[PDB]
Design a protein around this ligand. Structure first.
Ligand SMILES: [Zn+2]
Lengths: 442, 387
């Protein structure tokens, strides 16, 4: 168990775990932003996010996504809301450490820092001057922001996009940042989460349902929603992230009715897991393993030949980063002294990050109702105050014993729980497939 | 009768089935291939938190372009009959109703606000009667008794199909393939088959598989036999990988559309219970007597029992729809895949026979007789099963 440190937004900058960070990836906020380190190399930044040129938190005229959409400029602006947001994720990170798979998940994220280099860097060099590994720390010296120090984080946990219900925000990478995440080196993850806001589903299709009560409309447990996003960080960090080029595309055609859906990427099917992984055939899934293997072998051979560094003053730290990335990828040592990829330990590692670490696996482990197949219907989303222990605890989530919520009569049910408040359909934006005829009919 | 329908129904985008594009899945099985001599594939403890700061380094500014904003448009879809979405809208209650009454006609329920559609003729009788100068629970329980018995209906079709039983009231509830009005859900489902439930969905069809070829020379001794054994490995792979493609299409395109009927029927059954709940409450206000305040506790339990009794009916529909989804894969998709695989086998076999006919003299101590007998590999085929 990696310890989850407690924080307030009122707490001052201590030049250790609370800092001010320069994030060029966020267009919405040009200035440096206040950050907190809840655990080793996993930072929370209670701020809204946007990658678009000419960004805006306000509601657009027409829908910008195929998903169910909800906007709010008020969310995560004042310090009271940032204090709520900070405690929220801190509370969720404690709930992750309740089961064993969550302790294992966090451990991978902590130790698996991104490699100091890429395809551009030659074999004999560590590059310590890249944005995929480094983030700049800054003081406010005499009416201006000066660059003081750096950090080497694994996951940066921002607030939501303009669309608060956007779950694909974590998959957004800009090609030059992405190339490390494909080719084994990895990159620091930038998550955009909204704990209080929840997606909702029902068990109408699944016969595994309450015969006592009936078919319920339930919410995703925000720990599972967070752990879902953290599995993309896991893939981004260990350099086995499948590209956004590899995707499923929706078919819309006149003749039959269908969803004008989004593109469901291969990463999204991997991170969800279960039967829907078989949508990607084995001929493609095998190719990704063989590619990942080759990159891990070439990264081991890089560690054998390194002598210089960029910048030139980091030659003393060559043995330091040899120890960090050897433990990450879990290389062995052959009869020369060089690093080598143990194939049995690679297969064990790669299968853990793809098959074991997934949403369907978490939902069974944490004893919570959840989506059974990725294409389960999205119902009207909900809001919930997770910080109040009468609504949501660390040990059991929404399903609390004292308020008359057993596992069949789950607290996740919106009908049977008043704490799961609904968002109004006036604010919630949607696309529509318009069913018309304009005829007499019989 | 006829009724001029001049207005649209706005169905939400994410309350429709996701159907993937056919080309978007995987093209590997349809690609051509050349076979060679070596084609072959197949802790956390309690630690201490460290100071995360490090010495500053000169980073150049990473000039990110930024994402372009894209506005998405709605879809209009013109249809030639009152399909499932029209039949669903008829069943809904209006905004702040007063005195609702059930009706057997869909066009009346769409036009008039108070009138609500029902797919159960017997229910339309017993609901609209009300408390006819008698006791409250005498009528109220007869409505729920009639509601329960009708939603548990199952008709046993025989002769054709692996589907054991079908649920008949889906026809008048959703008007699948214009089944209602004509009134032959049971007949049409048997005649057309399991694909009837997919409204206007293009019939499944698979294009021809990729062709195997070899080198022109292959002039070395041992080399021609060394590659023919690898050709038979890739044949087994093609059967294996074709079945995985078939499943990839089924999971992303077919299963999603069948579950749409599960969702639609739950909405349908929910609107019927909302109509019964509303009518009981309206008739409760209209009723009066000495035994009225006594039965209050009992009547609220009868309202809550509707939610349980829908789940009993849904577990039958889930069982029914699950069969339809699985039997589609067996009888609509799989035969077309096996037929195309048998064409691929015959085309690959004629290639292998003519490969040996081209190379008689090389590498033989008369092993042609031995190698021609290895066609027994084509005799047996790779099966496919479910569960
Ligand atoms: Zn995701």
């Amino acid at each position: 168990t990696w310890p989850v440190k407690d924080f307030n937004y009122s707490d001052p900058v201590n030049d250790n775990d609370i800092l001010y960070l320069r994030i060029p990836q966020n267009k919405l906020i040009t200035t440096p932003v206040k950050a907190f380190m809840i655990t080793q190399n996993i930072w929370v930044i209670p701020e809204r996010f946007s990658s678009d040129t000419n960004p805006s938190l306000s509601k657009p005229p027409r829908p910008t996504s195929k998903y169910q959409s909800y906007y709010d400029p008020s969310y995560l602006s004042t310090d009271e809301q940032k204090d709520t947001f900070l405690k929220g994720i801190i509370k969720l990170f404690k709930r992750i450490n309740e089961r064993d798979i969550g302790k294992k998940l966090i451990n991978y994220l902590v130790v698996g820092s991104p490699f100091m280099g890429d395809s551009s860097t030659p074999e004999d060099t560590f590059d310590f001057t890249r944005h995929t590994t480094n983030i700049a720390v800054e003081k406010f010296e005499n009416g201006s922001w000066k660059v003081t120090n750096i950090i080497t984080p694994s996951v940066l946990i921002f607030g939501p996009l303009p669309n608060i219900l956007d779950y694909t925000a974590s998959l957004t990478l800009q090609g030059q940042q992405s190339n490390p995440s494909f080719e084994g080196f990895g990159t620091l993850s930038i998550l955009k989460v909204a704990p209080e806001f929840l997606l909702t589903f029902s068990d109408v299709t699944s016969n595994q349902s309450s015969a006592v009560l009936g078919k319920s409309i339930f919410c995703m447990d925000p720990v599972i929603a967070l752990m879902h996003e953290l599995t993309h960080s896991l893939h981004q960090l260990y350099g086995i992230n499948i590209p956004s080029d590899k995707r499923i595309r929706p078919q819309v055609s006149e003749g039959f009715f269908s969803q004008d859906g989004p593109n469901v990427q291969f990463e999204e099917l991997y991170t969800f897991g279960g039967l829907d992984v078989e949508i990607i055939p084995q001929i493609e899934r095998s190719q990704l393993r063989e590619k990942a293997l080759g990159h891990y072998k070439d990264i081991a051979k890089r560690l054998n030949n390194i002598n210089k560094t960029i910048p030139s003053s980091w030659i003393s730290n060559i043995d330091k980063y040899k120890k960090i990335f050897s433990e990450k990828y879990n290389f062995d040592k052959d009869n020369t002294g060089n690093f080598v990829v143990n194939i049995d330990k690679f297969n064990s590692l790669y299968s853990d990050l793809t098959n074991v670490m997934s949403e369907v696996v978490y939902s069974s482990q944490y004893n919570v109702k959840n989506r059974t197949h990725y294409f389960s219907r999205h119902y009207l989303p909900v809001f919930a105050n997770i910080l109040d222990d009468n609504i949501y605890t660390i040990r059991d989530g929404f399903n609390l014993t004292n308020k008359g919520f057993n596992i069949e009569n789950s607290g996740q049910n919106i009908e049977r729980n008043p704490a799961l408040q609904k968002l109004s359909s006036e604010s919630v934006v949607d696309l529509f497939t318009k069913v018309c005829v304009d005829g007499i009919i019989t | 009768g006829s009724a001029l329908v001049l207005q649209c129904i706005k169905v939400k985008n994410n309350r429709l089935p996701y159907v993937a594009d056919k080309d978007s899945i995987s093209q590997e099985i349809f690609e051509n291939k050349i076979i060679t001599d070596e084609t072959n594939v197949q802790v956390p403890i309690n630690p201490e938190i460290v100071d995360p700061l490090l010495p500053n380094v000169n980073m150049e500014p990473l000039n990110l372009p930024g994402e372009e904003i894209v506005f998405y448009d709605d879809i209009t879809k013109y249809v030639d009959y009152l399909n499932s979405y029209y039949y669903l809208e008829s069943q809904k209650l209006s905004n702040n109703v007063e005195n609702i009454t059930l009706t057997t006609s869909v066009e009346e329920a769409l036009g008039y606000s108070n009138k609500i559609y029902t797919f159960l003729p017997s229910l339309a009788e017993k609901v609209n009667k009300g408390v006819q100068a008698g006791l409250f629970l005498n009528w109220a329980n007869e409505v729920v008794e009639d509601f329960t018995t009708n939603i548990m209906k199952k008709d046993t079709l025989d002769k054709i199909s692996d589907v054991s039983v079908i649920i008949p009231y889906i026809g008048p509830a959703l008007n699948i393939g214009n089944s209602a009005l004509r009134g032959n859900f049971n007949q049409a489902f048997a005649t057309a088959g399991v694909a009837f439930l997919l409204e206007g969905f293009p019939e499944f069809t698979i294009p021809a598989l990729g062709v195997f070829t070899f080198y022109s020379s292959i002039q070395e001794r041992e080399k021609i036999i060394k590659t023919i054994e690898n050709c038979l490995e890739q044949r087994v792979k093609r059967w294996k990988d074709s079945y995985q493609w078939m499943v990839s299409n089924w999971l992303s395109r077919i299963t999603t559309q069948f579950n749409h009927i599960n969702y639609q029927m739950y909405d349908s059954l929910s609107y019927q219970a909302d109509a019964i709940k509303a009518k009981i409450d309206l008739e409760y206000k209209k009723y009066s007597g000495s035994d009225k305040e006594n039965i209050k506790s009992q009547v609220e339990n009868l309202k809550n029992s509707l939610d349980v009794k829908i789940s009993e009916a849904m577990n039958n529909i889930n069982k029914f729809i699950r069969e339809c989804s699985v039997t589609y894969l067996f009888k609509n998709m799989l035969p077309k895949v096996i037929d195309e695989l048998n064409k691929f086998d015959l085309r690959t076999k004629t290639e292998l026979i003519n490969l040996i006919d081209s190379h008689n003299i090389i590498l033989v101590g008369e092993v042609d007789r031995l190698k021609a007998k290895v066609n027994e590999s084509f005799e047996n085929t790779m099966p496919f099963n479910i569960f």
